[PDB]
Design a protein around this ligand. Structure first.
Ligand SMILES: [Mg+2]
Ligand SMILES: [Mg+2]
Ligand SMILES: [Mg+2]
Ligand SMILES: [Mg+2]
Ligand SMILES: [Mg+2]
Ligand SMILES: [Mg+2]
Ligand SMILES: [Mg+2]
Ligand SMILES: [Mg+2]
Ligand SMILES: [Mg+2]
Ligand SMILES: [Mg+2]
Ligand SMILES: [Mg+2]
Ligand SMILES: [Mg+2]
Ligand SMILES: [Mg+2]
Ligand SMILES: [Mg+2]
Ligand SMILES: [Mg+2]
Ligand SMILES: [Mg+2]
Lengths: 60, 144, 67, 185, 260
RNA sequence: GGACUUUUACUUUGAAAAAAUUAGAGUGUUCAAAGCAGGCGUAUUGCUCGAAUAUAUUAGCAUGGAAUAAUAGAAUAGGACG
RNA sequence: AGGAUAGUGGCCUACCAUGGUUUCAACGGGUAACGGGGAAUAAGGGUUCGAUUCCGGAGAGGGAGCCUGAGAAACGGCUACCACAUCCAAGGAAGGCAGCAGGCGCGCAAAUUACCCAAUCCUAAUUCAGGGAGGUAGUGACAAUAAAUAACGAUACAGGGCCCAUUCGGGUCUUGUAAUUGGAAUGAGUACAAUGUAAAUACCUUAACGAGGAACAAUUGGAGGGCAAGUCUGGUGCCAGCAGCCGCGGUAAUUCCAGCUCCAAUAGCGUAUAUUAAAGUUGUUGCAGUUAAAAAGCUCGUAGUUGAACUUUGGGCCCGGUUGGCC
């Protein structure tokens, strides 16, 4: 109900965020190949199992 | 017992009682009264086009503090005036005044969403271009 | 490959019992040079406006043009 | 107007999208059998649910019922013919014990892998898709072909394929020409 | 609306014609003739769909316009001529004759007959009436009128037509213990013997029929067609003799035949 | 032909209740959705399986039953039987 | 009783009688109502949808009238009136796309002013003519089916294996990682040709060309919980924004904006609206009414609904079949 609500501030954060370009990385396989690598990453190559199975653990 | 008739020949009473008490449901009442056709900003439609009348800054409801950047628009097909929320960071600079927008609901079949008070619609497109495409920079707003 | 086949008795029975398109495919009969379907229909509709042969109005308009 | 065409869906999505207990089981099946996505499991689950429903609703009625006998024998015969159900354990109550793995191991990918010639299920799928396998004399490039227990002995490389013979291959020809040029002649 | 219909949409044609759903928006509408279109077989359907002597209606018309086909001794060049039950179709070439009888699955089956049987046919008496000048006559099921009939010929009897002159050569009364053929309802194609009949004044006389191997059923009198006595029919039966084996034992016979 | 009929509800069985759609039998459309095709000979000028089946309600029509529920009868006998 | 009709009938007329329907809901009003076969969902019972491929009805801008005809109250027939609209030399004359294609308008919302009678059928005096009926192609992410975006090869390796692995030493079958490094496989696409078709375009085949970043480069939506997936790193500091709901943001944000990574479905994924299950939150099955919403202040009372028991029970004799202890 604020008739004086400042509309001039729209887009502030998206305007002032530092523009960081996406890194160039090799393409990930698509389809059955992606299901293959997902299966290996989840059931064969079980890397991080701290406490229980962890699937997107950070550094340290 | 049970306060309702049970005899084999009481079907008329049971059917009429169910018909009468059916009017206490929300959806049945709306369907039978045709409220969407009669009293609804859209004519029962999912989307509607409008002409932006002005840009509004709506204060957020407690316990949130924000300006929600809505637009007051007038619908083409019936001339009703509604308020539509413009969803994203920015995207209010894409709307402008006197422009043509397309509106959908929020998803609560009426029932203003979240901390925005009394706003039941959101802008999908402006000047024939998707607002998501304008925000992702896939497209550009036409001059016309 | 799998297809269908017919063998007739002599040339004439084939040339009478076989469709024109297959005659044209095999070269036995030639293609008739007809106008397109739309202009054929338009010409038919044009002739619908004429009662009789048309020589009456033909010489009448010739008189109007050469008066 | 012409009579309408009939079509139906061959799969059904699960009621709960995000439950790990079957999400990982589905990924296990996909990795084991070289499947493209979860729809290939949903299709087999849909088919097996149809068959289990038929067997349940057809066992609920007593024996020597002409309905139960006719459709039970038909279902038993179809399952035995396709090979999802063995020669033994040939009964409707033994139908209810069937699992998705049975149809997955009756897939064309599975048999192509099992009888040599593939060395991997993923190699089997790309081999089938690349028109290198003939179930009889017929090239079959559909990995879910569902072999029917009488074409097993007849699976071999296609005669029109380089592995079947009579053709060296596109890349083989190109590099044979280049190697001959670099050698001389 | 506003007058008679001339088109017959496919999916509205009789199911016993066994027409493919695709390959055409329409079906051959039978012309007016001796039989109702619901229980008639058009010549184009018999020649193209049943006998495979033609590939399409154009070749059917080419066949008919050469006077090759004749129904009941007459050429009948009409493509959609309504040939029905008991009718005799003759092909001048191929030296064969056909009689239109349903198989037990309630559809006209390609049934070949000899010249002697093709010389005659049977008809069911629909009514016996006095015509003009006091001349009696009978009306058969195929829309045929025969003047001066036997006085003992009553309604729903069977008469034998010489098919070269429209004359009655013999007749069978409708009585218990006579071989009947079912021409309507769910019992199309059945051949059995009358047990008895229920009067039911006010409509729909009911007939009890016993099969050759003791399957008893009941049928409306309108679907009953007398064809002879207990044994020795007046018409050669089609392959099957109208018994209606159950699907299980049809399966068993099919498997015995296929697998030797 | 009448010296011929208490009236129902209810329930059984049966005739019919378009086709398509639905369920479902058979069939290697390369698989499948489909479709209603097809299959087998030595191809020496031909043999042959099919295109099933089920359900489709209420009302009407016949039809066996007479528990359950209603209805009627002989009380100023104007009653039954010949 | 007559008239009229093809014919029954207040269908109409003359005379007569005062009847006919209704709380078992007449009559009137509304329908964003054409009916049905059927569709979606669905333990059972149900709920919702059905303008639309088949059947039946109705209509051809709105009404009315009529001719011809077996059949029309026809409209790609006529006549009049109304509305709308076209040509004109101003005298007059000609119209009806809710057929096909196409245009304007309307809106959230829907395709070519293409080819052909070869198929299906239909009509005619008819084998032949005609058919925007119909078929063929064009557009087409409505929906549905199948399923390409890669598969095999070097050197550290948790040792899960064998001489008590006492030696990064050994056949330990090692799928499992490090821009490396090599051959092989192929259709997307191109087109000989043939086939396909009335002609064609495509599909099934097929001579050559067609892979190294196979750039021949998969997307959509998420990562607090419901609900699978991050105390990772920058930016912002109740701002911008997110968030179906609960909530997240006021200087260490797992929730915003981004990078990395991960998750889910995947040539599809999200959003809105409606509807179904979930909903025993419509209830017959099967709710609830002391206090959560809900026993009329009390009694009488018609319709409606529902209403104690009792009338031939019990016994014997025969005929005629079977998931069943020996021909
Ligand atoms: Mg019509
Ligand atoms: Mg009268
Ligand atoms: Mg009167
Ligand atoms: Mg309406
Ligand atoms: Mg409808
Ligand atoms: Mg009309
Ligand atoms: Mg006429
Ligand atoms: Mg018109
Ligand atoms: Mg018309
Ligand atoms: Mg149009
Ligand atoms: Mg059309
Ligand atoms: Mg993030
Ligand atoms: Mg989680
Ligand atoms: Mg209270
Ligand atoms: Mg009280
Ligand atoms: Mg009070």
């Amino acid at each position: 109900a604020k008739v004086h609500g400042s509309l001039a501030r729209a887009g502030k954060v998206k305007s002032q965020t530092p523009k960081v370009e996406k890194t160039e990385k090799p393409k990930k396989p698509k389809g059955r190949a992606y299901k293959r690598l997902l299966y290996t990453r989840r059931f064969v190559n079980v890397t991080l199992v701290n406490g229980k199975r962890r699937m997107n653990p950070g550094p340290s | 017992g049970k306060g309702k008739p049970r005899g084999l020949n009481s079907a008329r009473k049971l059917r009429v009682h169910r018909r009468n008490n059916r009017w206490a449901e929300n959806n049945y009442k709306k369907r039978l009264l045709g409220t969407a056709f009669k009293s609804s900003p859209f004519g029962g439609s999912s989307h509607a086009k409008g002409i932006v009348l002005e840009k509004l800054g709506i204060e957020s409801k407690q316990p949130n503090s924000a300006i929600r950047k809505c637009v007051r628009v007038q619908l083409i097909k019936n001339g009703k005036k509604v308020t539509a929320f413009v969803p994203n960071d920015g995207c209010l600079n894409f709307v402008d005044e006197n422009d043509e927008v397309l509106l959908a609901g929020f998803g609560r079949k009426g029932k203003a969403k979240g901390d925005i008070p009394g706003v039941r619609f959101k802008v999908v497109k402006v000047s024939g271009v998707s607002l998501l495409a304008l925000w992702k920079e896939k497209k550009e707003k036409p001059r016309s | 490959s799998v297809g269908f086949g017919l063998v007739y008795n002599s040339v004439a029975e084939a040339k009478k019992f076989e469709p024109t398109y297959r005659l044209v495919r095999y070269g036995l009969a030639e293609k008739v040079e007809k106008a397109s379907r739309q202009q054929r229909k338009q010409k038919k509709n044009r002739d619908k406006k004429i009662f009789g042969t048309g020589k009456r109005l033909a010489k009448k308009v010739a008189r109007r043009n050469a008066d | 107007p012409r009579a309408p065409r009939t079509y139906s869906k061959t799969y059904s999505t699960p009621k709960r999208p995000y439950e790990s207990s079957r999400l990982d089981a589905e990924l296990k099946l996909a990795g084991e059998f070289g499947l493209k996505n979860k729809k290939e499991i949903y299709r087999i689950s849909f088919q097996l649910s149809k068959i289990r429903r038929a067997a349940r609703d057809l066992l609920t009625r007593d024996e020597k019922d002409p309905k139960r006998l006719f459709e039970g024998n038909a279902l038993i015969r179809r399952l035995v013919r396709v090979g999802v159900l063995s020669e033994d354990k040939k009964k409707l109550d033994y139908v209810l014990a069937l699992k998705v793995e049975d149809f997955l191991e009756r897939r064309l990918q599975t048999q192509v892998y099992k009888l040599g010639l593939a060395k991997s299920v993923h190699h089997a799928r790309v081999l089938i898709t690349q028109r290198h396998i003939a179930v009889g004399k017929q090239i079959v490039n559909i990995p879910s072909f569902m072999v029917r227990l009488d074409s097993e002995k007849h699976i071999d490389f296609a005669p029109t394929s380089p592995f079947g013979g009579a053709r060296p291959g596109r890349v083989a020809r190109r590099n044979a020409a280049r190697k001959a040029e670099a050698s001389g002649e | 609306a506003r007058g008679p219909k001339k088109h017959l949409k496919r999916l509205a044609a009789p199911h016993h014609w066994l027409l493919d759903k695709l390959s055409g928006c329409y079906a051959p509408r039978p012309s007016a003739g001796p039989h109702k279109l619901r229980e008639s077989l058009p010549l184009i359907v018999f020649l193209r769909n049943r006998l495979k002597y033609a590939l399409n209606g154009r070749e059917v018309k080419a066949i008919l316009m050469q006077r090759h086909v004749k129904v009941d001794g007459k050429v009948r060049t009409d493509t959609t001529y309504p040939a029905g039950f008991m009718d005799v179709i003759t092909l001048d070439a191929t030296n064969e004759n056909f009689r239109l009888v349903y198989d037990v699955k309630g559809r006209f089956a390609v049934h070949r007959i000899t010249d002697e049987e093709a010389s005659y046919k049977l008809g069911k008496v629909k009514k016996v009436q006095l015509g003009k000048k006091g001349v009696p006559y009978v009306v058969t099921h195929d829309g045929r009128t025969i003047r001066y009939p036997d006085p003992n010929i009553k309604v729903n009897d069977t008469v034998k037509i010489d098919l070269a002159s429209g004359k009655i050569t013999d007749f069978i009364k409708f009585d218990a213990g006579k071989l009947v053929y079912v021409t309507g309802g769910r019992n199309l194609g059945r051949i059995g013997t009358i047990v008895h009949k229920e009067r039911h004044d006010g409509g729909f006389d009911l007939v009890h029929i016993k099969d050759s191997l003791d399957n008893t059923f009941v049928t409306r009198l309108n679907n009953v067609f007398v064809i002879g006595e207990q044994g020795k029919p007046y018409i050669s039966l089609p392959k099957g003799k109208g018994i209606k084996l159950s699907i299980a034992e049809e399966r068993d016979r099919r498997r015995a035949q296929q697998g030797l």
